[model samples]
Target: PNVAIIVAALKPALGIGYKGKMPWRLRKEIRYFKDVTTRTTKPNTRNAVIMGRKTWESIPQKFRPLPDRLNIILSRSYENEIIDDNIIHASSIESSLNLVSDVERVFIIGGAEIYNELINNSLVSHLLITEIEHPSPESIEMDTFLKFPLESWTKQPKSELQKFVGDTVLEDDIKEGDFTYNYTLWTRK
Candidate 1:
């Protein structure tokens, strides 16, 4: 069986994002995400990442064509519209599954909607959650924010989850107050 829903997001509870942008501009979390997706693991012969439309848009345009892996986008609209040759659009989860069935691993990245849909179906096999400790004083209003009760999963960090205090990353320039964030990985219980 193929692994599904390997969620990667900034920790310390930035959640999806404040508005359209990431709440904490932490460089550590960004680098961590890049490293995980690119590195190969046993049985991970070919890796493909699936994301919702907004999640695709959230990625910086230049980094859009993620290296060493195929990028798959899930969208209901733009069925016939092509976004990029490297980007495959799937109309539904079944289609998405069919598209990457032969691959050793499939990672589902997200905005809240995609996560919610997958979580509801109990399709997630593992979760890579990056938690940030800093709170955004000016929290942006959102109709939905993704929530995974940490206690609900069996979490075993691959290594000690990294922690940064003051300004450890250049992206930390967007400081709302004090405090920084950390990250860890979790698998379904």
Candidate 2:
């Protein structure tokens, strides 16, 4: 199966992270992320989540393995590091994909650099983006330089490019403390 890249960004700027953490807090987006990454189409299978070393470490220890999905961390320096049975270390993204060859779906969870590399290499097939219309705190300093590189896929023609499938605004009840965002799905053409 093709690899899917899942990320949340602030629109106009496409900013994703700030100092190794997300700039906004959206509970609904978090739950949706968990569902997409862990839910499999088959009855007895699990999905795989491939992320960079920094992204992996950014996850709290209590949620290290991220529950049901296979956690694959890409890192050249931490090849000997052992985190848990559910977590595997790979020297590169290709090696990480090789480790989860049997999985039906693979999701690339990011920290900027990883997304840029995969998107630029044309290794991603789908993009699940949660576009934040406004910053939560409204005071968080976005890492202006860090972006998802959507242009890599958007530049292609509709006949041979990833197209936006659909999107939904978070319901009033689902909004995280007045946060407003839209969940969008894009598939390869």
Candidate 3:
């Protein structure tokens, strides 16, 4: 199956992100993020990942071109900018999907908006959510977001979620919140 997991961290109030960053920080959570993505697969068969321009930029300079995987960035305007090597620019959802159609697996990394965009459209098959029990009282209203009802999907356990070593760690700090994560796989009825 061509599996794609949408990754994010949520709070007890089902909240994610304060500004453009994660809500909490935990070393174990960081390890968990790395752990879940590190997996053994067939040789020369790389997984694909799709993200927005901000999400792409959020990656460190040293890890600009994630190795051992096909990286696609969704952008409305990629032509004006100097495109980076190993990172493919996708102008639209259809184009992005077409670009990675043959991949054995896919990962949808986010900057909040992009993940929400893909999820609401039912463009994703799986969700890797890290749940934090405590959240700041301040609530930010987002024009776009995604909510997963447990009754709607199935979850799989990752015995050891480690980093995909070939690439740099996604973020620097974990933030502040309780820790629980969900690796949900689903299909619309």
Residue 76 of model 3: what lDDT?
82
TM-score: which candidate is best?
Answer: 2
Query: lDDT per prediction?
Result: 0.60, 0.68, 0.56
How many Å off is the CA of 46 in candidate 3?
A: 0.7
lDDT of 2 by residue, 38-81 (tens): 75666677788888878877889886778887888888776634
**Which candidate ranks first by lDDT, i.e. highest?**
2
- State, as a TM-score between 0 and 1, how close model 1 is to the true structure: 0.71
* TM-score comparison, 1 vs 3, better candidate: 1
User: Which portions of model 3 show Cα errors greater than 4 Å?
Assistant: 1-3, 38-40, 79-85, 100-102, 135-151, 154-189
Local accuracy of candidate 1 as per-residue lDDT tens digits, 1-189: 344555544444435655665544555566756666555555546667778889888788998867777788887775733466467887876676665445656677777878877765565666666554445534534333676666777766534222211122324223334545444556667
Candidate 1 colliding pairs, count? 7
| Residue-wise C-alpha lDDT for candidate 3, range 1-189, written one tens digit per residue | 344555554544555555565545566655655544444455555566677788677678797766766677878866323255457887766666665444666677666667656665556666666544333334544333456564666554342222222333333334544344443334444
Candidate 3: worst 10 consecutive residues by lDDT?
159-168
lDDT score of residue 51 within candidate 1 = 82
Where model 1 places Cα greater than 4 Å from the true spot, the runs are 4-14, 42-44, 80-85, 135-144, 149-151, 157-179
Could you arrange the candidates by TM-score from highest to lowest?
A: 2, 1, 3
Worst 10 residues of 1 by lDDT: 161-170
Q: What is the lDDT of residue 64 in candidate 2?
A: 73
